[PDB]
Design a protein around this nucleic acid. Sequence first.
DNA 1: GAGCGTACGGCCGTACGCTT
DNA 2: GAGCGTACGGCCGTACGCT
Lengths: 480, 482, 188, 188
Amino acid sequence: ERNITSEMRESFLDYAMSVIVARALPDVRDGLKPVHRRILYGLNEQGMTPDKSYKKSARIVGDVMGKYHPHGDSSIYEAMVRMAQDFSYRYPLVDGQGNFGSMDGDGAAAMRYTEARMTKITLELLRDINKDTIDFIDNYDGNEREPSVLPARFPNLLANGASGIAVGMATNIPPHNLTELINGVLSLSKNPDISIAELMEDIEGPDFPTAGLILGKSGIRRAYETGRGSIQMRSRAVIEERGGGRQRIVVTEIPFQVNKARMIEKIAELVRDKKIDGITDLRDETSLRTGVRVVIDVRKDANASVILNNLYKQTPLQTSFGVNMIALVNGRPKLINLKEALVHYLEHQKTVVRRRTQYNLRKAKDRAHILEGLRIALDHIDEIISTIRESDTDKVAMESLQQRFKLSEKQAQAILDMRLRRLTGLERDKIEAEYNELLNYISELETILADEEVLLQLVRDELTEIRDRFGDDRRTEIQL
Amino acid sequence: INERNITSEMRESFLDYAMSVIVARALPDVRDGLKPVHRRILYGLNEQGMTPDKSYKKSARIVGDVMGKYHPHGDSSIYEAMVRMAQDFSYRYPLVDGQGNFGSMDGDGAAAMRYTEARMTKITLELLRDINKDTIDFIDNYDGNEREPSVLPARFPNLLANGASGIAVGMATNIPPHNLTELINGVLSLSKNPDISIAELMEDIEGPDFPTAGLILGKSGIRRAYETGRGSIQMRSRAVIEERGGGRQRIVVTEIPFQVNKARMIEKIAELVRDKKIDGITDLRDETSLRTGVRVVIDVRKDANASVILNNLYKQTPLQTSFGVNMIALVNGRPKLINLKEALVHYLEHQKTVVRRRTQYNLRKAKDRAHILEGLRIALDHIDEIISTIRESDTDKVAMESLQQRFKLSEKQAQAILDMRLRRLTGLERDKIEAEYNELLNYISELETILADEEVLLQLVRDELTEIRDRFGDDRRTEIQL
Amino acid sequence: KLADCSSKSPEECEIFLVEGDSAGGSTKSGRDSRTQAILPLRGKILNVEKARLDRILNNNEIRQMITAFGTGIGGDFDLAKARYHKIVIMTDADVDGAHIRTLLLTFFYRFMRPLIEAGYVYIAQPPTGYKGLGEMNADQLWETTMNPEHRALLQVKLEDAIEADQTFEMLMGDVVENRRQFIEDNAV
Amino acid sequence: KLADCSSKSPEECEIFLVEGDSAGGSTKSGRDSRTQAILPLRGKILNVEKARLDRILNNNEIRQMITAFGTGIGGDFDLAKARYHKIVIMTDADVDGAHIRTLLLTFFYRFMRPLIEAGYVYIAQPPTGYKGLGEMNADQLWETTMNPEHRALLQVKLEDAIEADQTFEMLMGDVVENRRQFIEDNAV
DNA sequence: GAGCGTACGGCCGTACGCTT
DNA sequence: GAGCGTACGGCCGTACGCT
Ligand SMILES: C[C@@H]1CN2c3ccc([N+](=O)[O-])cc3CC3(C(O)=NC(=O)N=C3O)[C@H]2[C@H](C)O1
Ligand SMILES: C[C@@H]1CN2c3ccc([N+](=O)[O-])cc3C[C@]3(C(=O)NC(=O)N=C3O)[C@H]2[C@H](C)O1
Ligand SMILES: [Mn+2]
Ligand SMILES: [Mn+2]
Ligand code: NA
Ligand code: NA
Ligand code: NA
């Protein structure tokens, strides 16, 4: 028998917990919810890199479902689709072919009807993942291994944003320009005690894929200061003058996460309900070549400026973005502001780059050890050979080679495994040349781990490379 | 604008569909006994190594690999086919090992594709046995991205063992399942006498052996179907008349005919009692559980004769059904109506050709290997001269010239020597190369014997067929009454 | 789509409320058709602590559960009109499975309280397993959780009506902040 | 099911009979909403050569086409009541697309013959390849088969009435054997 | 408000041949 | 007389937090 309060307390907590930290909230480090990371990682393990051809969605899902994500396919596929939509992601992470829906609320065609691969920027999220930069864990059945977090060589959380509903809390972080983010990470790295207001000298405010307008910097300020603010988003519209004293409103940019077709329905509802008037026609002329374009025709008598302003108020022609910056930090959720957001990220890069350099050291030294035994061997190759020849078994040659030429097991083994073609002159030089270079590389790697600024500067240097390859113009105009 | 004649369009289009459905959808190949879709589940299972010894993989995943790499059609046509291959009441010799709900005889569908698990059965290893040893031709897939086999080696005669029932265009096919132990004996008997008659082949193969057991009435239909390729076979449920106490009588059905929905059979009897077209029946229950198997109980009123009711149930419900044989298989890429012997002759021919190509492939690799070994023996006999020759060399390119020229070695042999490791110079290792070379000379001869004489190959085919017969052969299920 | 049992004696009968449409069908083939009925639950069920009565009584699922129990709800609830003397909650072994349990236990506590006091409400117990209930076949589903001899049913018992009353209010109620602080205090 | 165009001037209007719903969705976005109407075809249409008139006329897919053309069929067929001057058959570039296409042309020839004689019926010409229609995006789908300035249509012409009548009865009639012959005779 | 986004499948059309 | 077995999808419920 079970207590009804107890059963409720425990069981509900169980659900809640998991949803907070294995469903609806992104990590602060790579800016990803579990399903997103599992889709990118699966694309990786499948080798679905940009240079290879597309792969049908149903296969990608099928693998991602079975290997890491023990849930329905619709949650997986829709998530991926989103990542492919240039109107959802400021820096799309999936490169998809066929129908991946529109701003008009249009669904994407089912798994079978679309194919997909990873974008070039998705490579940067996965860079160095195989160089012990991040900790792995078991999957839900123990039969596979998967990452706890991706290296994330660009600030994903603030770049692409995050919006999910959890239990006890929700999150809502707007997308930003990448150039501005990085530059803001560079300023932070140079000055640990830098002010929010000073960081905004780089990071002006959000930057939605959908362009548009932001009214004033007050919301943005509060947002980045407290982690909670309200940001007004306004469509880009102009009133142009036409013959016989007529006018029309043309809307060329609409708010983030606003259904275009559904906004138009609302304008027409207000014309059938006569809650607004002066409007003669209403056309959606959105083409590939003009992009978005909604045209509103205005009755000669009416003032189109009045009409437009009433529309901002009465339809989602103007909408609010309610910033609630909650990410998983140390695996617990946390309201964070712009600085903690950047600070946990920078710290994530300092770890990734350390552990990598640390990894490249263990590998350099390990190789250099082997090359040394190979160099020895190459300087007495006559006696190395006869020594192996006098041996009955590989083990005796191993014993003999170690005792005679003061060699290690890894070194004796390496000499035994040596292919006679290495004895040709060119390969004999290659063995020396590799050693020498490797020594200077271990030098470089030991500089890095010994000085925190040399390391930090490395981080700066690589981040600036990303900036110069993927950084782009700002799309959203922030008005005062 | 261009103009297209409606008549011409109707002939050209409909011929494309018609032909496509025939040679590439609806009819099995006489060799491996598989439709295209089927082959591609099996191959897909195989290229993922979803062998019996490795745990079940999700149905979701399998279908995707098969659809994206080989079968550009909807997910359900692939899945349903895989689910049929996992049903012990559908396949005499199940080709798929499924876990979860894969449907029942009552005709209820298998649970969705995310709610099931699958891998091969041990017998399906035999359909794919020797596939990579240039035994079967490969062709490009639909997009050109992958490769897929045109047929499977099929080391057991599968067309006849599991049957076929596909509706095409302008034709259909319907082949019944058969017992393997009987089928292989028949093949053997044909291998020793090319002129064996059908009636003789029927000493080995009594007739079709359904996975559902039950009864076959008379051998008269089996011959017609086996001689001409068409004919009708009467299937009857196994039903006995139990007598409980003095008055009471019960009719218990334990086996029902093949491809006969049990729930729908039962309803028809419930229907006839309701419409008063059958008298005597008190209750009607389906006590089918896993341990008991199929059990359908009909309670009969006292003063009502069970036998009159039982016979009338045969004539009136699918408790007795006919199986309309129509043995049509793809033969040299064309559809063909084939009799039992043609079926068997084509399979044995497939088998001979598969073993001969296997042997040829093993010989090539064997002859190739011994060549390398020869060069390696030459090297180890003159080691110091060799080492000397390679060290003198500036590059590996000249090292080959200097070795080929000096010791009389092929390009191949100088590459093997330049790719040899210093651990090959120990004393024990020299012995291993001498050993490996000795057995290998003996193995090449064995193979060269097989290829020169038709009868050794013939026997080897027989010998390997007999291995399948023992390991996988089983007792007859379907009783044949006269 | 409820699948009901042959027997019309509530004392020996029992209804299984199962997660997902897949586990519904398997359960229906695996069941003792004489004493065992199944009401499949298409997904997440309404939180009744959050809705006003007019939605509740118009909620197809909540509708199908009342019709099945045959007892009416609230004050009009009649324990003698109960068609089943066992109501077993069968959900997946996973976290969402637990959610749908709480959701069910919320409806039961807030409209069919005397059903809990009379110890008719049971929770089934499938194996602790990454596998769902839908994934497992009919036989495994019957041999593990549905046959009286082998099954482990936790009879749901109520002890303190004032504690429980505030627990539901907190966990399932309108106020988020109180459910935030519960999470905070009790989560590790 | 049909998504009509804004224009009510038949001479400039055209309807597309598209295969499968996914392509029917993208064609609905890529189209020229002023002139071009989309009537999706969710699979294999009824073969009217094998159906009796009561089964034909109760058939939804068939019923939707008649309404959408608005000409009526049989002896009540008026070319002046037509809502589109171009009826375009747009199916996948595979054998099943070909089959649907034979099924449509059979319907038309048997019920709206003078609609073919007037040259109103057309066959679309999508891009050849393994990819079908539902796999193309709406824009590349508009450009390749729907845009009048770049598209290639096949206008269907009836040159010999007596010879065609014999062709439909063989290919699509209920006598199988004559079909078989034709296959075997032309099998390549 | 409602709807943002990760979670928890059934029903029922057609061709086609042979045979009931 | 109905059905066998490979082929050609979209409709819709709920929980959860926030303006
Ligand atoms: C298994 C599904 C079943 N299906 C159905 C089912 C019912 C109905 N029905 O209307 O009842 C129509 C269809 C048509 C179908 C589809 O769903 N979309 C499509 O465009 N092409 C198809 O073949 C077709 C689809 C391709 O395959
Ligand atoms: C994407 C689908 C949507 N879905 C729907 C959809 C509509 C309705 N509906 O009835 O409107 C109910 C459900 C419930 C769902 C689920 O969660 N559980 C289930 O057993 N079956 C399902 O289909 C649920 C399913 C698991 O996931
Ligand atoms: Mn579950
Ligand atoms: Mn197609
Ligand atoms: Na593992
Ligand atoms: Na507004
Ligand atoms: Na009969």
